[PDB]
Symmetry: C3
Subunit: 318 residues, 3 copies
């Protein structure tokens, strides 16, 4: 079911593309339109080959040249598009990690929404790129049950999806009820073990049974029982278990709701998911907010940045 919005261009000629891009920047000024039309129409792997052909022909670094010619949010988007897909989540995490100035929204968004297979790949790329252990750095800049839940998720050890055992569903739903609503205070450890390690298909059934038993959705309990960064993370984990595309659609919605735009979040989501499930994200977005992702981006963004974003997204008639 999972589909992105960007695929390999048929009849790709990396050398031709590199020439077009050189022409766009060569000499006075910059043809931003030529740049954005080309790069939004090539897959990430294809952008890498363009970069290598550009360096072969001209002995210039393509990204460095674009960083020189381009400006503002447009530049930020183009540089994000050029990052190899295998490194992008790691790069975003690395840039989130910076002392008490750490960007917890980013840690939560990525770590909650990436699959165990994705996280294994992220941990490897991060260590190779930056010479540090991701878990160590996360532990360094976080504290409390928030850190613990992140470490649990970073183990990428979630139970595999297997046949559902109804008695285990009952036991876990009851455990959660006893650990939160029936407890003075909260047994956070219990929530973390169950939400962090049980399989996705098992937890979906647990969530339904928990509603049946308690009269609350698990998200309602979480808001009633916790707060702060732990609350945001537990909500992101639950929402991701229910539907990753739905959680990411919501993330996009809130980046553009209110005054201005959370541009960093907008760029990160669109670029990171453009070859995975951005199509599914569009669908969830239109189902849940009765408005196209396209029309919300169109209304929230300006100039070449807007143009490039809309080309990546598609879905005018969503």
């Amino acid at each position: 079911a999972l589909r992105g919005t960007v695929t390999d261009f048929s009849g790709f000629d990396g050398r031709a593309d590199a020439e077009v891009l050189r022409k766009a920047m060569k000499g006075l000024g910059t043809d931003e339109d030529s740049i954005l039309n080309l790069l939004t129409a090539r897959s990430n792997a294809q952008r890498q080959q363009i970069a290598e052909e550009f360096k072969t022909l001209f002995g210039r670094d393509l990204v460095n040249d674009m960083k020189s010619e381009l400006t503002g949010k447009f530049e930020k988007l183009i540089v994000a598009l050029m990052k190899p897909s295998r490194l992008y989540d790691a790069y975003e995490l690395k840039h989130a990690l910076k002392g008490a100035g750490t960007d917890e929204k980013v840690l939560t968004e990525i770590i909650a929404s990436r699959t165990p297979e994705e996280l294994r790949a992220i941990k490897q790329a991060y260590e190779e790129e930056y010479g540090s252990n991701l878990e160590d750095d996360v532990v360094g800049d976080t504290s409390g049950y928030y850190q613990r839940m992140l470490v649990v998720l970073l183990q990428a050890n979630r139970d595999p999806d297997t046949a559902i055992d109804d008695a285990q569903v009952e036991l876990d739903a009851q455990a959660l009820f006893q650990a939160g609503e029936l407890k003075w205070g909260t047994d956070e450890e219990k929530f973390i073990t169950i939400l962090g390690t049980r399989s996705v298909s098992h937890l979906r059934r647990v969530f339904d049974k928990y509603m049946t038993i308690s009269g609350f959705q698990i998200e309602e309990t979480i808001d009633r029982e916790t707060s702060g960064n732990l609350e945001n993370l537990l909500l992101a984990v639950v929402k991701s278990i229910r539907s990753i595309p739905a959680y990411l659609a919501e993330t996009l919605y809130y980046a553009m709701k209110g005054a201005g735009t959370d541009d960093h979040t907008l760029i990160r989501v669109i670029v990171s998911r453009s070859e995975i499930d951005l199509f599914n994200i569009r669908k969830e977005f239109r189902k849940n907010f009765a408005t196209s992702l396209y029309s919300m981006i169109k209304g929230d963004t300006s100039g070449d940045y807007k143009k490039a974003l809309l080309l990546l997204c598609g879905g005018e008639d969503d």
Copy 2:
């Protein structure tokens, strides 16, 4: 013939074990008894899996938590037990290497008693763990013929055991006689080449022939001809060629002989050899010192430390 005292626990459940350990430390105080009974009854590989399950369930680092809860020599022993077997000798060497403050006893003990196959593995683990070349660091903190002999041994290039050539045995025994007892001064280079590079089975025959020719055991010549760190190393090499378990039994004996205990040596030997030849060490110990290793540990050690050591050793009725 080689047997350790610790083996894989049958019916191992890493998750269950992790829960037991969490219960032991959770909240006020610490159940040291639960900790030592469990960990001494699991193999090193099994301890690693427990650590991974603990982190998966609770998002806590098991060793860090134990370092927080435990104290003293007991803590030192538990942390030593948790070090992956493939890294432990490298860790001990790294910790021995520290300027003119270097711990030569440790360099000698490990490098003399480990097989060429073990040393190849140690050199690799050390470089991977610490980003340094073991040989370079040894050379950095040692001097003289002591350093040279260590470098020779670090090459892990000892002749393989093959059919014994009686004439070569005669030649080497005579060479040794001429290089030491018949020489004004000592040709250390000759001792180092022969002791450092000839095969174990060849040198065992050389030692017997040397006694026949000279009327001295090679160990007696070494004490007569050399002194200081070179003497200790040459003795350790000879004793290891004769019997590694016997050399390690002697090492343990002297750690506990006299006032107090060399606890660092006691922990290192017991832990490092617990899955290789600690059973053989016990046997040599009882043969050579007419007393059980168990009874000597029992008499020399206190509290939870004593309990854990005795469980690892076994051999009450040795």
Copy 3:
């Protein structure tokens, strides 16, 4: 057709060799003659095995000992001979790279004359040895079109030799004519793309056609149109396309022409090419300068340095 002047010694005994070398340095003074006669008569791989046997027997580092005993240009040559072949070009490049004090002659000589297969191997060895990216370091210490051409060559992406297309030969020869002689100023980008990326066999035909069209050899155009480091690099690239051995023969010729000797260049060329094409270099040298490489070295060099160089070169009767 490609032949070196040094090959594997038949009946090689690394242990025997190590003993000879130890004897040469042991005690007061040094037997330089024994050292140079042996090492010039062993291949690079064989020198590595000698070094390992020396360390195994004596626990001494062979190169460190030679650095201690030897002096001057002789020492520099012996140390160069001991560097593993797979690391030598990388070592020379690393030593060329040092701020505005950078040795451009070395960057040009190596990068222009090494094949794409050789450069791939060099880039890998450099990163492994020094923890840095070669391209990054080159970019750091160079500027302008000189840097660009070096980066192009460092991509090691030259078109493969395939069937020649006469129309493409015409197009490229005309392109070059239009980019230089017919242009006010020079389109350096065009020269760099064509000279840097087209196949060797294609460019050889382009050079002939360019002469036919313009009445100039490409080297004459280069001198007419460019200057400085870019000129030297473009000439080295063209000369290498025509004949690597011929370019290296010329490089040697100029190292010894005039007062004194460029010893660093002499050592680098002889050692780096001794197992590849130094025989071909000798032949080109004798064809083009009507004098033996041997006789020029003999006349330009002194002492043990001279002796060792002449043994490596051969070709008294060239």
